[PDB]
Amino acid sequence: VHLTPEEKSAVTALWGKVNVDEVGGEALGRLLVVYPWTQRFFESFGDLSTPDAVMGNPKVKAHGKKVLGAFSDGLAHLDNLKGTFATLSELHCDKLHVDPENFRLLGNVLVCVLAHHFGKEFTPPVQAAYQKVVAGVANALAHKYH
């Protein structure tokens, strides 16, 4: 993944407007609704029986905050995504057994959420920049999988 300087600026500028807890809960919720097999990691999270139950689930929201918080922090290191997420890559492979395809699905949902949230401000060039970012983060989180 290689963003141009203007793309990095674009990412940073839009993200400055993001409520990370809110977008994190929304993205993880939509992940579990749109791609319900991803629920397999969250049997301990309680009621996931309907879309409203998933989106409103406080444990879903809490993990959403956690995941997107780490995502957000990683945006400070667009020049070292592999290195920035290496220890989380190890954890997800070694202990959590999370198929890295889950990271790609979440990236796709995140892009949809950003488009929904920002509307026309999420221009085709801004989207392209964010596609590079979510691909790069997913690739970084997948790197340690042996």
Partner 1 sequence: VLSPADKTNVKAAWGKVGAHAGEYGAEALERMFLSFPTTKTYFPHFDLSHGSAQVKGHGKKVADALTNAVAHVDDMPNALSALSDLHAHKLRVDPVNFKLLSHCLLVTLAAHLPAEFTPAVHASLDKFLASVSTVLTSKYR
Between 66 and 116, whose beta carbon lies closer to partner 1? 116
Nearer to partner 1, 62 or 135 (CB): 135
Amino acid sitting at position 137: V
State phi, psi for 92 to the nearest 5 degrees.
Answer: -65, -30
User: By C-beta, is 61 or 63 nearer to ligand HEM?
Assistant: 63
Distance CA 16, CA 72 (A): 10
Q: Is 132 annotated as a binding residue?
A: no
Q: Which two tokens stand for residue 45?
A: 């999270």
Are the CB atoms for 11 and 75 separated by under 8 Å? yes
**43-72 positions binding partner 1, by CB under 8 A:** 51, 54-55
Binding status of residue 2 toward partner 1 by CB under 8 A = no
In the list partner 1, ligand HEM, none, the entry touching 34 (Cβ below 5 to 8 angstroms by class) is: partner 1
Q: What token pair was written down for 28?
A: 């993880």
Residue 138 makes contact with partner 1 by CB under 8 A: no
Task: Give the type of residue at 66.
Answer: K
Q: At a CB cut-off of 8 Å and minimum separation 6, what does 37 contact? A: none
Helix (H) or strand (E) holding 71: helix 58-74
Among 14, 60, 67, 140, binds ligand HEM (CB under 6 A): 67
The correct pick among 11, 23, 33, 106 for binding ligand HEM (CB under 6 A) is: 106
Ligand-binding annotation for 1, yes or no, is yes
Size, binding site for ligand HEM by CB under 6 A: 17
Binding site, by residue number, is 1-2, 63, 82, 92, 143
